[PDB]
Structure formats: structure tokens, C-alpha cells
Amino acid sequence: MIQRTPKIQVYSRHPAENGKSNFLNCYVSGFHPSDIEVDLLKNGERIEKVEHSDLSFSKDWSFYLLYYTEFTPTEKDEYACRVNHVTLSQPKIVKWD
Numbered sequence: 001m002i003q004r005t006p007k008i009q010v011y012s013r014h015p016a017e018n019g020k021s022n023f024l025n026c027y028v029s030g031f032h033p034s035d036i037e038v039d040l041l042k043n044g045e046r047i048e049k050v051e052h053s054d055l056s057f058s059k060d061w062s063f064y065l066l067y068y069t070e071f072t073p074t075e076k077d078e079y080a081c082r083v084n085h086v087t088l089s090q091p092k093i094v095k096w097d
């Protein structure tokens with residue numbers, strides 16, 4: 001068996017074909033096992049509506065998840081990604097910078 005803690009990166013992106021749109025992204029990479037729970041947060045509250053969740057694997061024991069959705073951030077709101085995995089004794093929260 002093998003278990004690897006996921007790398008977690010939170011960032012925003014504007015699709016070039018529609019610059020006005022902004023998307024909040026949580027890229028969870030290189031983890032194993034595949035079982036996982038991931039949420040985007042807005043001011044500590046779970047965002048129920050997340051339009052995209054793309055899962056893939058490279059080696060049979062390495063998974064990747066891109067979890068993102070459109071959003072409209074303001075200088076007053078705080079965004080983050082919360083991840084729960086067997087390798088994390090406590091859920092890991094990575095804030096969006």
C-alpha cells in the first residue's frame with residue numbers, strides 16, 4: 001500500500017474567451033488513496049454550488065482533482081479550500097491569496 005498527502009493550491013483564473021468571468025480554483029494533486037472530501041469556502045461557509053470537479057490519475061497510485069466554479073470576490077470576503085483525506089488528521093484549509 002501507499003498513501004500520499006495531497007498538495008493543495010488555491011488560485012483564481014479568468015477564461016481568456018470571457019475575461020469578465022472569474023473562477024475560484026482548488027487544485028488537489030498527487031494524492032492516494034483517491035477517497036477525499038474537498039470544499040471551497042466563502043467566509044468559512046461551504047460553497048454548495050461548485051460547477052466543476054475534474055478527477056484524473058497519472059500512475060495508478062497518483063490522483064489529481066481540479067475543483068472550481070465561477071465567483072465574484074470582493075476585498076471584504078475571504079475564500080479558501082478545505083480538504084479532508086486519510087493522511088490529514090485534521091481537515092486542511094488553504095486560503096486563497
Ligand code: NA
Nearest residue numbers: 085086088089
Ligand atoms: Na482525515
